[PDB]
Structure 1
């Protein structure tokens, strides 16, 4: 009735084989008593790194060990512990006199790859899914608190990006905006995991357009739209010159984190956002150096 090779044909198996299981590990593994072992055929110490697996040799096999009940917690090593720490990811200037952002408003492209500390931590993984708490610390360049009213407005991609301090877009009829005085504590708000992909992608080895991919367009390599969440716009609410030079610092605290595929930690200084470029002539060693392998 059927052709057999069709009946076995495991084609269409949606579930993955696994091979490993997650076990509880609230504390560090304890050490159990070890005694001398003088025998043939059993060699813990001997390994074959070629295989690609880490040595499974235990302390007990390398020395006579006592017993230790390790109750040291592993809680602080979870992704949430490691990442749920507010950090600077954006800085916006709103000076009186200047070439940066006069007029009294700015449009910050939402991109956390602009600051080294936070960037390196996340670039530890290839994919990350999470919600976040954005906190906005505003004041003058001197760090002085001033009686000024601001309006922050999240502008999802495709929404009208404000062209002036009095842009019609500030009616923010559907966009979420925040109105705060610099005298009020820094504004903080909760953001979900928005993105058509299942996770944000720190590294996207590919292009996003499907074209010819000539010289001029090599600007698009590594540009993944599933990460461009839109822009964050800010203006001093009014129709006249601010009167005070402002600065807004954007801090982000990740929460409800999931991360996948760990990568080697950043090695060379960062140069540009969403672009692993490094300084070819200043390629420094991962760390410190000595004078000889036989001396400290």
Structure 2
């Protein structure tokens, strides 16, 4: 009272089940009005439509817009991991495997997710398992989810497999593929495929520049698997993991990856061979 100085979004949602119609138009001849002329410098895309540039007929368009809803674009199971437990070799003659959950190892799904900066969703995981040649044998397996901070099994018979609190699934290689629903688990409000920053404070000496881009809010822990038995199993095992996004929301679209992927954790690209987004031709005046 005795000190006076101490006293939004202009756009929203519409439902568009079908493509816009075309209204019939005729010739327009005059000064002042000029819809064909634009100013791309503004940052806006052109507002001109067919009826302003030509004479149109009427078209009652019933083409649906439903299949391009992000939900239908993403809710299709895709491969996010291939885990192997061979019986001979340097791989894992141990009968168990601990896999750090990182889904950025396969391009098809990755490129689709990276179209957005942030995504929030639930997921359906399907586990397709078989011998490396595709054959199936009566082998009992156990898949266990080990959240960050939970003891990771150190052997085929580590106490951790008691799985008294962690969720585990027991299934036979002969049963259909196991399948479960997973909720949204980040401590953040959304998973983020791009984090322009460092996870901790400190000097960022070239020794720990591998910290750059690592967002802890996306680190979901470990996925462990073993043949259920005190004795070694005679079978090599191939586990393919598929993920299906559901109940999804996405924010901030970005340019799509146009260089092959090199690493799971960063956007590094092969500098000696930078691919052009479009194929080439000889002359700009010839097809």
TM-score range, shorter chain: over 0.9
**Can you list the C-alpha shifts for 1:72-108, whole angstroms capped at 9, x where unaligned?**
1101001110000000001100000121222011111
Is 1:132 the counterpart of 2:152? The answer is no
Q: Within 5 Å, which residues of 2 pair with 1:1-296?
A: 1-7=1-7, 17-296=8-287
Specify the SS of the correspondent of 2:208.
helix
TM-score scaled by length of structure 2 = 0.99
The separation in 2 between residues aligned to 1:194 and 1:157, in whole angstroms, is: 11
Secondary structure class of the residue paired with 1:195: coil
Unpaired runs of 5+ residues, structure 2, are: none
Look up the match of 1:12.
none
Question: How many pairs are equivalent?
Answer: 287
In the aligned structure 2, how far is the partner of 1:2 from the partner of 1:103? 78
Q: Distance in 2 between matches of 1:4 and 1:273?
A: 56
1:287 shift after superposition: 2.1
Describe the SS at the equivalent of 1:6: coil
The Cα shift of 1:2 comes to 4.2
More moved, 96-105 vs 218-227: 96-105
What root-mean-square deviation, in Å, do the aligned CA atoms of Structure 1 and Structure 2 show? Answer: 0.7
Deviations 1:111-164 (A, max 9, x none): 110100000000000000000000000001100011100000011000001111
Distance in 2, matches of 1:112 and 1:50, equals 39
Secondary structure (helix, strand or coil) at the match of 2:209 reads: helix
Summarize deviations over 1:149-190 as a string: whole Å, max 9, x none.
Answer: 000001100000111111110000000000000000000000
